[PDB]
């Protein structure tokens, strides 16, 4: 499918459930081939989302 | 010959009055002297047996739009006998004529008029000084700092007269430049 | 007004809200009127019929794509509507100076400009519409191209009322088709024949001229829409002294020959076309052409009552230097 | 032809002949259609074992 | 006496020369040469862009030996930057220095085959270049305009599998620089050709500054690697050919015996290459590894500020000669002590000996100028900057 | 007239047949593009296997090859030798720098892309192209070639 | 005075001179190759062999997931030696950093990989493909759509020549 | 022969300037004769062209920069001399207002 | 005044009339060094610059 621009297609990957503060975001599994290593803290009730894959980190306790 | 025995024995067997400034360092032995004692002094790094510079390099030329002799030509020699780089420089103007080498070195004569065609500085008495490098009816030296890089006339085919035709620049997308350039340098 | 939204230094690269479909630019006056359209930035549309190379040598005119051939049938009303769909200015040049066995004098002039101007009407966004006709354009004119010009010009003004008609006069050129062929023939011959037998005046015109005046009348949204000018020369010519400015040039020999008008006009008809109609591609006509010769039965003139050069402020080119120095390649 | 190693969704298939040790006639395509085959109908899985960029067969690069 | 000009279009004169030369009817008085149609502008480009945007242009100088131009701008910069260099780096630098001396004195021999009427020796050594291009085309991305040699160390390491490849191709290039040589040094025609043909004396070529394979064929024993040995060429042994009597023909000898020595040094370099990292530690010439930009924040400033800013060579002035296939290339830097280079300009060996063909090609006949033009191996892109 | 229609396109067939087994292209190469149109013509991507063989004269030769930087000086030249060029006179501009402006671009003596010269059929980028990649630029222009029906538009005309 | 005045070798050097010995030797080489297999490869069907370091068509390579690689740095657009690249950004609604329009002009391209290896996220790379040889001109403007349909078509083998050489720099 | 060293005195530059207009009329018939142009133009009126083109540089001072103009004077001429100018490049080259400027553009 | 040296440039006639700026840029306010300072530069107002009607390049 091409209809879905990236911009409506990142926000339908439900946000990735995670413990612990923050988490370290990569990109890729390989940390070559991704992005640079982004750590955000997830600590608001909103998923955090990496600046540079888009990905949506959200806290899983409390 | 080693590059300091070029230096001492150079500096102390040259007349004092040909070179106003002179550099030793690991770069490059240089003499910075006048314009008009330039034949003299090629004459006689050529022809002494100590240092016997038989070959000239290249004529260079560097633009300095900021002090009163603007120009700066560059005579880069080698002495293939001693294995050593010997390097002389001149100031120079956009009026001010400059003695050739033509004599001394016959292969100096197409890098003179190569410094001609890019900077515009005449040379005496030299055989056929002509524009060598740029086209034919070229206006302005491209090599100064003044010159536009895209140049001033474009070239393009007019279908009304059947051959190709010289236009002042249209540029479809102009040269973008980039400042780079930081403090704390 | 809207259109003709100048932007930059008047050059290749320059803007001009001119986008135009040019249709005939693969002949004569084409690839002058291309030429002077595009060498101000407006952008160009050429749409052709024939081969894709025949427009391939008009693309050099512009800047990536101010110059788009496109592909029509001028049989297919679809097609002409759809290349002149992102227009706001039609030019019209097509017309054919003899016979086809597949178009006739009424099918190539009147019914395609009927055709155009109907088309361009239904689109509705031709702010400014020429249809180019020839000077000598009379409805009683003997020859059956000229009324064809004459039934384009006048449908085309009840279609458009405001669609200017442009009327040059045996434009010469590089590649024109009346001083050419002349030089050809005697190249190989050299007695360089005379069907009108000298004494039929006409006004030659340069074809920049033809193609600056039509700019020009683009470029001024005033007192030229709806009018029909009148394009002509400087100097009344004939066609003695017009084959010695052509001859001095090409010299070697100069031979003349005069063939008496009645006679001429009934020997060439019958070698030429009058019969053979079996091969669709017939070997296209010499300076014997039937119609040719009707058209040189009355002088061509421009009425001194209509519209000129000096009523749209420029000056013909002399005929005598410039223009006609393309005769050298053939000395 | 020594051996034919897979096909393709397009229809053309792809060889193989292995040499002692001097270049030629290595791995080559035949072409499913006629009409002038475009010279480029490889897709990219097929594109890299073709020109010996990787020793990968292209079906297995899909998996 | 009439004077007509050349400018084939055919790939004998290497296209883009004009040639307006006065003969006495069958034989030549003058020739002088027209050159200005391949300035494309590179000494003007040179000045708008950082000493990193600027090291392509010197693949375009002397396309046939891409990678001596740019050791001689890499080497510029380094003795402006005062930047050491890895053992690996320098190796394998020289190895490739002799791949493009290889390139190149196959390619001049088989043009100037070509001008004289052999046919066959050209298809040969084409079908040989390509495995070298092939060598290019693995360790870089381009066959032919390979940015491999950066002014740090190179762009990138070696394959795994290059040194086998390489060490295969050199076990049989000898014998295949020996059926070239079958043809040509025992052919009668060959020697009838070029014997006696643009002689040069030492002293006349010293004076039109031939420094090359033009200087060593006048007898001087001038070689800018043995003089002013600049990688790693003392640890390397070769011998440097000298002519006799240099007239189109002792050239040829000169280059062959200058292929089996570089053939010879690459040998060398293949059995005494060392492990360790290609690039210099400095860091500010030098790009960061792509594992490290990405976990580090000092690499990713570095590699921020050097891909586009580039790095500041301090304000100085030096000219840098390098021992190209062709002769004596030389890149002269003036430094502002910016990002950019205030002046570059390059002295093309292809520029003197162009200007010598007046002189060597008087009282000669006009199938005799062909063949001039082919013994001095001139191409116009350096010619012409 | 569907009775003929067969002959006019089995003519058609046959002329660009012959106008495509048989290409002599006009080397003009005059920069490093023309080393790598030169290894095209070689040993190994044998141009003379598709009818292709380089002419040295314009007078005699189909299409032609822009390998290179145009410069100022050297236009006039590229245009006047395009002008003794028979009918069908193909354009090919091989490399970077021929097909619009190039690295450099930006020059007092540099022609922004042969094609403001001579009209141009078949771009073919790179600096340098492969030999491949001129090659598959000759196949477009032989593919260029068979949508040819000059017979029919003569004929429809 | 060069002298090859001995009775022996004087008739051993008229022989060779009179029924050209040289000439045979040369001639029978060529011969040898007449026999002997050829080098060529017919293109159409067989490539020529090529490197994982390929440089040829530019592709802009997007996430996995779907998002694409590029967040307007302009890295590659300042490291650009022939000034080829163009690149217009805004931020999106999402709050994103990305570009509208990133076209690079493939005629003053002239493919060096500087621009790939400037990329912070691997977002433009070079393609193994070589075969563009458009009609047109404007056609060689790609425009940051033609980037993305390439990146897409050669995707799964632009990840295969990234990971292999990912080990090197 | 060689290029002259320079002028130390106007005298000197004056003389330069006659020297270079009457070798550029003494060449100009062959540059009639060369570019195949006879009744196109006279060759009186280029005198006047040239006449004009030196009368241009009128308060010109210093005898260096004269020096140099006149240098580029012959350099022009012998190109020209040469058939390397392009065809009829010479005869092209060598031949309120307000409102006016308001109404095509701002920068007038 | 004083235009012989403009004369003998041999640039376009016409460009020997611009009016010109001659001023020392100052130190950016984003950034607190001073390492671009102290130099003059001659600013020729070239405020004419339009858009290509293809790709939105800047046309000059
Ligand atoms: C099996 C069937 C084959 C059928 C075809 C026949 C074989 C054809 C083979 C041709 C292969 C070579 C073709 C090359 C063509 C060009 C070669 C010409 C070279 C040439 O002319 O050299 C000349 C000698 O040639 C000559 O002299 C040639 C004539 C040979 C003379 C006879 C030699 C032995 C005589 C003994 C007689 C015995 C009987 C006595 C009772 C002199 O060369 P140069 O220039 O260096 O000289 C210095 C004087 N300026
Ligand atoms: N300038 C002059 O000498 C004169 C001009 N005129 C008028 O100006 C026009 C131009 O003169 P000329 O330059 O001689 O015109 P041309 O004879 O050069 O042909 C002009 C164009 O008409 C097109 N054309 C002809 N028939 C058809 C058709 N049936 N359907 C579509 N397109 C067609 C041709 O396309 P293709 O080539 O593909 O058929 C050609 O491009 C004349 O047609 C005439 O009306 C009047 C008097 C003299
Ligand atoms: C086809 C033609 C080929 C050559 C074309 C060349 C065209 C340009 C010619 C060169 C243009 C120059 O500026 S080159 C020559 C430039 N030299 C000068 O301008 C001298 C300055 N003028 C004076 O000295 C006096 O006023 C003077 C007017 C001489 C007399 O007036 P008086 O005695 O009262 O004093
Ligand atoms: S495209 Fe590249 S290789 Fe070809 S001429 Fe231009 S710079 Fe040279
Ligand atoms: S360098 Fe890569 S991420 Fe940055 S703007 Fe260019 S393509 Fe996008
Ligand atoms: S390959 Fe080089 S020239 Fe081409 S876009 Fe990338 S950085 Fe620019
Ligand atoms: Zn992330």
New interface residues.
Partial sequence: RSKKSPMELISEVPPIKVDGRIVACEGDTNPALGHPIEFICLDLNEPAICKYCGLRYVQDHH | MDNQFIFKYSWETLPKKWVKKMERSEHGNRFDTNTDYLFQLLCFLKLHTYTRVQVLIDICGVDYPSRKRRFEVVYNLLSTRYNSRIRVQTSAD??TRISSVVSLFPSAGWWEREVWDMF?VSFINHPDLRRILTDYGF???PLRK??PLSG?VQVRYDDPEKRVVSE?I?????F?YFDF????? | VGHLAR???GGR???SGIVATVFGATGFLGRYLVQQLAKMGS?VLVPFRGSEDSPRHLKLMG???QVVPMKFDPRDEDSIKAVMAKANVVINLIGREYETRNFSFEDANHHIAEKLALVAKEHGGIMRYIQVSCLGASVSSPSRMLRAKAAAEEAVLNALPEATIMRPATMIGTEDRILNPWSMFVKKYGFLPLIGGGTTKFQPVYVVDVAAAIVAALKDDGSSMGKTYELGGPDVFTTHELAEIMYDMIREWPRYVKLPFPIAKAMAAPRDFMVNKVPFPLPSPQIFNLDQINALTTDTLVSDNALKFQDLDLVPHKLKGYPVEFLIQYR | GATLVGVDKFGNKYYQKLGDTQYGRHRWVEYASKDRYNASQVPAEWHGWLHFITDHTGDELLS | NFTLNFGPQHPAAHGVLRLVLEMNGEVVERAEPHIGLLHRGTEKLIEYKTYLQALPYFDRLDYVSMMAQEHAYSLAVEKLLNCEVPLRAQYIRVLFCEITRILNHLLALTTHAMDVGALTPFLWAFEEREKLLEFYERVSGARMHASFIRPGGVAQDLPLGLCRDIDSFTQQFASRIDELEEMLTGNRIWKQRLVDIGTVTAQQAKDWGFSGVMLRGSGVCWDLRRAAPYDVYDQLDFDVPVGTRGDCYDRYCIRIEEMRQSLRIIVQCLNQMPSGMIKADDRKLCPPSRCRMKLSMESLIHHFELYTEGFSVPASSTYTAVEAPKGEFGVFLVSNGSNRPYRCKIRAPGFAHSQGLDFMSKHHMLADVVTIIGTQDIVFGEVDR | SKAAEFVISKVDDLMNWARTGSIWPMTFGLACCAVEMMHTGAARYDLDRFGIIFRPSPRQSDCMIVAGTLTNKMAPALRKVYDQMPEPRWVISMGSCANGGGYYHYSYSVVRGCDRIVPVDIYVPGCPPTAEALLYGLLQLQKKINRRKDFLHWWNK | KEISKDWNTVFERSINTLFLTEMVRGLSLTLKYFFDPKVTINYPFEKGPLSPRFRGEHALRRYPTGEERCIACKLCEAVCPAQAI?I?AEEREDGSRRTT?Y?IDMTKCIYCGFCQEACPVDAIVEGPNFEFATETH?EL?Y?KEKLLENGDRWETEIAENLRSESLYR | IGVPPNSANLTEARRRVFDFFRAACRSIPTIMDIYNLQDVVAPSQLRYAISAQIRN?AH???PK?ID??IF?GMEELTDIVDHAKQRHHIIGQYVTDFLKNFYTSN?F | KRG??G??????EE?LSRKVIIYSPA?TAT??????LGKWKINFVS??????????????
């Fill in positions: 956009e009026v515009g206006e302005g030296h003044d010159f001033y002042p249209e540029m479809t997308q102009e973008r350039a930081s403090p704390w340098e | 932007k930059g230094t690269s320059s803007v952008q800047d990536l794509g | 163009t217009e329009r076209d404007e403007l425009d | 540089n010109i001072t210093d920069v140099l103009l580029k920068y | 012989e040296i004369k003998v440039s041999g640039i376009p460009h130190r950034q607190s060094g001073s390492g671009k405020t004419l610059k339009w858009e290509n009607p293809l790709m939105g390049w800047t046309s000059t």
